[PDB]
Amino acid sequence: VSTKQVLSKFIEKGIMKAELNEFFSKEFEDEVYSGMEMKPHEIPVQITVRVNKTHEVIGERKSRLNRIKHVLMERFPLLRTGVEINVEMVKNKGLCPKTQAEYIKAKLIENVPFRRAVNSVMRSIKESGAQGCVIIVSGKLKGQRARSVKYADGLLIHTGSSKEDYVKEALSVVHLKQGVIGIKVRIMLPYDPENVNGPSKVISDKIKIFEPK
């Protein structure tokens, strides 16, 4: 029994997932792309792709969604047998950081000033229930010198196991007349026992005390 063999096949399922998520972002660059999740160990591989719009991405009534599914049957021999992709829209568009990341990318394409762009998102994050949001805009914003302007508010943790639960961060790159601008959006999630809004387990430092009466 080989330990080398078992690890190699699992990351083989992993290395296609890294390619596929890299593929979908370039594929749905006109839309908002919010990530994907994969269930590959079954005989039908089920791909859930998260895009802000549902009716546009499926495309000419299931045409282009099967057209992009057709070439994915060709590329990956690992489970070439059965693949099914089905799109979903994010429940809160503010809480996904890529949704806000590609938003200001579209604003910078339209030559909107980034300061007007950045307060538009961090207001929309706060009104959507999220706990804290930092927006980092790096690039040649004014002039040839490049600055890394960093707007922030609210509770955003940086260390702990709660970091991988509670902050979800994004990176989108912008190509303009002047050069390359990178916009990092890192958003803290509100705690909710049902995981549709945030993590189920609380941050470890927070405690609850019952009441004596």
Binding site: T3, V6, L7, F10, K39, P40, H41, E42
Partner: protein
Amino acid sequence: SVDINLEGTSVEEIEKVCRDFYAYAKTLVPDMGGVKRLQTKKGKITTRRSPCGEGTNTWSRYRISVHRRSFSAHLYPSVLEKFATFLKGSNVEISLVIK
């Protein structure tokens, strides 16, 4: 003679799988063996952090570990198929040996 072999990287998922399968197996048979956990086959990759040679010897170690569970019994092939239909809502990799 059935060998139900299942492998998974997430442990809180593969323990929910073996729990509901053992809830399914005791409905079937009482001579069903307990869930046996083989050696967690683990692997590490050590990598330089810098995409250049400006820094100190800063090495980031990434790890993968897959957890294995097994079941052994001697059943009917129709029971093997309804076992097989049970473990497809699970993301754990499933493979079976009938010898």
